[PDB]
Amino acid sequence: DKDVKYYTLEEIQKHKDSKSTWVILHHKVYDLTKFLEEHPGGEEVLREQAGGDATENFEDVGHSTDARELSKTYIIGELHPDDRSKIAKPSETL
Ligand code: HEM
Structure with a gap:
């Protein structure tokens, strides 16, 4: 589409609530805020892993290719x- 932006955890960390939940995966962040009530996994599930690394938590269920x-x-x-x-x-x- 166009030059992408380099998002940081320090920032994403902010949007770690339902209002705005983010999740890193494959050196790439995605927005599922609107996909909260669309994810066949739930809501609290996403939040639980909001603004954090959920690679293993994602690949764990071997997300379907369609998911990729x-x-x-x-x-x-x-x-x-x-x-x-x-x-x-x-x-x-520290
Ligand atoms: C944009 C982001 C995401 C998309 C598009 C997505 C998509 C999907 C899809 C399509 C399924 C499988 C359906 C199939 O294989 O036919 C699934 C399952 C699952 N996803 Fe995601 N997912 C996302 C983010 C997440 C996140 C952040 C988590 C964890 C925090 C998560 C946890 C799970 C789990 C645990 C399952 C298995 C469903 C079950 O609970 O029985 N997903 N996801």
């Missing part, structure tokens, strides 16, 4: 490469 393409539609932006290796969780400075 669905995301494309519900795309938002790309997650910084020097961010994914941050695994925002185990503190930053």
